[PDB]
Amino acid sequence: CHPQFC
Amino acid sequence: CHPQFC
Amino acid sequence: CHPQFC
Amino acid sequence: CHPQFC
Amino acid sequence: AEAGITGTWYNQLGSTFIVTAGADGALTGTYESAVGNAESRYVLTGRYDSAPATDGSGTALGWTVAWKNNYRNAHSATTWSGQYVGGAEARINTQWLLTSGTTEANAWKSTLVGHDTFTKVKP
Amino acid sequence: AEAGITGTWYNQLGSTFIVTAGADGALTGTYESAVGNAESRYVLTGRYDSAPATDGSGTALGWTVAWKNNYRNAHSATTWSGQYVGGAEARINTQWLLTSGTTEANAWKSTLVGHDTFTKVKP
Amino acid sequence: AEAGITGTWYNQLGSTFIVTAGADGALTGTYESAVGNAESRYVLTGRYDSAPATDGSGTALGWTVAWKNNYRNAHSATTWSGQYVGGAEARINTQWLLTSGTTEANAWKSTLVGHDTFTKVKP
Amino acid sequence: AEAGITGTWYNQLGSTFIVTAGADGALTGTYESAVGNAESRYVLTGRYDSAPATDGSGTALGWTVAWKNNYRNAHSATTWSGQYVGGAEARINTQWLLTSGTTEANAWKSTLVGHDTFTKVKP
């Protein structure tokens, strides 16, 4: 998952 | 107002 | 590639 | 005109 | 998809769109800026994925309204792009682009962007 | 508008779309990801302003392609929103939104945005 | 604006951003993808209108996060563009663009678009 | 990235932005709506990927300008999101969002979207 989201 | 909105 | 592009 | 443009 | 999409949907502002989803992926219907007047109804047309994936994915779809009818012409068109999500609390989550016809000098201000959620429940 | 829009248009990538602009503001046609194969042609539908302003303004329009045909299903739909600009070097300047059907956990990555210019001239 | 913006904000997903609004229109702070871990904190910088209009208008603002820190590099950057709205239930309504570094062949899929609402209240 | 980004860039309209890319991923500089006047210069701040991938990928970056300076306040902010692409003909391809402070009734028209390419060559 991208760090914006996790 | 634009018809999308009113 | 997505069909929009290929 | 907006300052982004003029 | 299809049977789940056909029906009346309401957004948070009070706009109504009525759509039929055809067997071959066509969407046809009307958008109403307010719930009861012909001068505020506009034609829409669009497309949707008529064989969506069987895991818990949304159904991708899109439609266009050009803002001209028999009473008004606002020289503009909006497209909505999103996905239907079924179930007990069905909704269509969309992002939209509204483009106005401009002169070439004014083309930088031609397109607005926003987002809209439609539900079958009017609140 | 209308007579000026009906025809074949090419973007910078090599894609082709063929559109008929109907008297009552309807657009109907096909998008081809590459210039010569049925497996790459998809149905489009849309709307345009059929009585645009008489000063030097563009004609606002939009269309949708759902990426399913007889050979492929990519579980996604794109909408293009923009304006036709006539004259000796006619073009349609658009912005577009591509939405994929996702799970609700993955919904944040569902929609890409970009822009496209179509010309009547293939380069 | 300023004093109203400085603080901790939460979005619907559980992300936290902590921002200081400086007297000369600067925003500085950190974004945390999850409420308690250094590996998930990233630097942000941005700007806001430090003399907003006195009628009931929002305060326009924007910021950038590049997704590289000491532990991870995701080769991507997001910008948020929106407006602060004050009062008893203060919020910042934003739209965002996430761009990934791509090859030129893959540039069409480089940018996602979405929207986010931040509140001072964690739910 | 870094050394390649620091410098003066021009877009197709005639706007100039001057940026320094710092070792720790910071961008600082000024945007000028026209090539020679203080009343048209505005502060920008942003971030970029300071260790980009070694294959032929772009470097992701973003920045914000709030449109207030000593002479003018336009009650608005733009964010640019994109990627630097190096080489003999270096360019930064961006998409942008311009948000104006609005009343809550007018919030639907708050944000415009467009795209911009910057080159080191003024034409």
Distance, in Å, from the CA atom of H2 to the CA atom of H4, rounded to the nearest integer, reads 5
What the block records as the tokens of F6 is 């009906």
Please return the burial class of G92, using the count of CB atoms within 10 Å of its CB with bins 0-12, 13-18 and 19+: buried
End-to-end CA distance of chain E: 23
What the block records as the tokens of E103 is 């002169």
Tell me how long chain A is: 6
- Which technique? X-ray
Which chain G residues contact residue A4 at CB under 8 A? 15, 33, 65, 67, 78, 98
Residue whose C-alpha is closest to residue H80's, from H37, H33, H39, H45: H45
What the block records as the tokens of G30 is 């950190």
- Residue found by looking up tokens 């920008």 in the block: H44
Residue whose C-alpha is closest to residue F66's, from E45, E6, E32, E95: E45
Which chain F residues contact residue H114 at CB under 8 A? 95
* Helix-then-strand count for chain C, H and E: 0, 0
Residue whose C-alpha is closest to residue C3's, from F103, F118, G111, F76: F76
Closest partner CB to E47 (pick from F49, F60, F64)? F64
Q: What sign results for the dihedral spanned by CA atoms D1, H92, F93, C4?
A: negative
Instruction: Enumerate domains of chain G plus CATH numbers.
Output: 1-123 (2.40.128.30)
Most distant CA atoms of chain D, gap in Å: 8
- Residue type for H15, please? S
- E67 contacts B6? CB cut-off 8 A: no
H103: contact with B, CB 8 A cutoff:
no
What the block records as the tokens of H3 is 């050394």
Residue of C4, C5, C6 to mutate when probing chain F, most F C-beta within 10 A:
C4
G and C in touch (3+ CB pairs within 8 angstroms): yes
Distance, in Å, from the CA atom of G122 to the CA atom of E62, rounded to the nearest integer, reads 34
For residue F108, give the chain A residue with the closest CA: A5
What the block records as the tokens of G77 is 């950057």
The helix (H) or strand (E) run that includes residue E100 is strand E91-100
Distance, in Å, from the CA atom of H99 to the CA atom of G95, rounded to the nearest integer, reads 9
Distances (CA, A) of H77 to G59, G79, G84, H41, H46: 9, 12, 12, 14, 13
F and A in touch (3+ CB pairs within 8 angstroms): yes
Which chain B residues contact residue H109 at CB under 8 A? 2, 5
H111: contact with F, CB 8 A cutoff:
no
Q: Provide the 10 A C-beta neighbour count for residue E22.
A: 13
Chain centroid offset of residue H1 CA: 15
Residue E80 marked ligand-binding: yes
Cβ pair E25, F51 in contact under 8 A: no
Distance, in Å, from the CA atom of E65 to the CA atom of F98, rounded to the nearest integer, reads 18
Give the distance from residue E109's alpha carbon to the nearest chain D alpha carbon, in angstroms: 9
Integer-rounded Cα Rg, in Å, for chain D is 4
The residues, ordered by sequence, that sit 6+ positions from G121 with a Cβ below 8 Å of its Cβ are G10, G89
In angstroms, what is the resolution?
1.8
Distance, in Å, from the CA atom of F71 to the CA atom of G19, rounded to the nearest integer, reads 51
* Helix-then-strand count for chain B, H and E: 0, 0
- G98 contacts A6? CB cut-off 8 A: no
The residues, ordered by sequence, that sit 6+ positions from H43 with a Cβ below 8 Å of its Cβ are G25, G47, H30, H65, H66, H69
Q: Give chain G as a 3 state SS string.
A: CHHHCCEEEECCCCCEEEEEECCCCEEEEEEECCCCCHHHEEEEEEEECCCCCCCCCCEEEEEEEEEECCCCEEEEEEEEEEEEECCCCCEEEEEEEEEECCCCCCHHHCEEEEEEEEECCCC
Distance, in Å, from the CA atom of H97 to the CA atom of F6, rounded to the nearest integer, reads 32
Distance, in Å, from the CA atom of G61 to the CA atom of G1, rounded to the nearest integer, reads 10
Distance, in Å, from the CA atom of G100 to the CA atom of G109, rounded to the nearest integer, reads 9
Instruction: Check residue H68 and report its DSSP letter.
Output: E
Give the distance from residue F65's alpha carbon to the nearest chain C alpha carbon, in angstroms: 9
Q: Residue F54 phi/psi, 5° resolution?
A: -80, -15
Name the 3-class secondary structure at E99.
strand
- E98 contacts B2? CB cut-off 8 A: yes
Residue F48 marked ligand-binding: no
Distance, in Å, from the CA atom of G119 to the CA atom of G89, rounded to the nearest integer, reads 8
Cβ pair E118, E9 in contact under 8 A: yes
